[PDB]
Amino acid sequence: AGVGTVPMTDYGNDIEYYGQVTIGTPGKKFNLDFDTGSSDLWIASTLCTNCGSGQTKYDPNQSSTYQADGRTWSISYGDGSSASGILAKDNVNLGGLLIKGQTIELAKREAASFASGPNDGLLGLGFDTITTVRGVKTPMDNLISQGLISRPIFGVYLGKAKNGGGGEYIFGGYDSTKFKGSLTTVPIDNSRGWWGITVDRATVGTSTVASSFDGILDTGTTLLILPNNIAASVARAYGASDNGDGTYTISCDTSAFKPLVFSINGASFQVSPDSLVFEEFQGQCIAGFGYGNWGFAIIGDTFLKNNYVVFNQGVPEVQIAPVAE
């Protein structure tokens, strides 16, 4: 792959996408979940006492470039998972781009869900205002400042398990074979350390299920999680029923449904009918949208596997376009 190109792996039914990162000298390959909703780079280490045996573990002793650090860290995600450990410094190779002396966070403890998943840790791609430890420069900060990328951007392509899965991240460039038409520039509000946008409205057919709302673009969240009222309004349009846990039961046959269309800055972005169904387990289908007790939405993979995004950290802004499929 070209410079800064990282081929992704689609886990399950578009649950998550992870790529290979080489850390240390001589270096080991790690499978990290690329997350635009967090800014801490953490990995399973040999200091970990409740880590998966299936996970690949960073071993300080085998990296001739490891530098010890006196600080500790602890994190807690929105789905309730967590991890904690110590800070350190080493080299990280992101698609042929060698980031020298990056602050990596080595896990001493991790939630079981982490221990049982396909990931060795996470790559945080949100702004540095939300790093859990103050003064830590995120990978994107180091690429820029080390001149590894000329444009302060990353192009994101998330594939669909139904079409073979895959995905691709490109640091400092993008790929037009992956999208159709022209890109639309949308300004970003990073005042909370996230990639925040304003959706002008949402429609199902001719009905306005929602008016403007704010959402964060999170590559690390599976569904489209919407405020309670918006969520309920969408559900009524599809005849989905509330499971009482942030999820909905929808009909497995989406052939009859209309796409959920989002009017963002003048253009139309959608959640195609197939995408309205997340998973089917023993004949019951769980919808691709959920609800949370938040005032903003979490624009997760359900949406991203349908639209190509160019994340610009410098302005900041994003450029979006419908996936070529």
Binding site: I15, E16, D33, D35, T36, G37, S38, Y77, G78, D79, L122, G126, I130, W194, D218, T219, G220, T221, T222, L223, I225, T247, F278, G290, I298, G300
Partner: peptide
């Protein structure tokens, strides 16, 4: 489903 902060 995941829900990464």
């Amino acid at each position: 489903p995941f829900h990464x902060l």
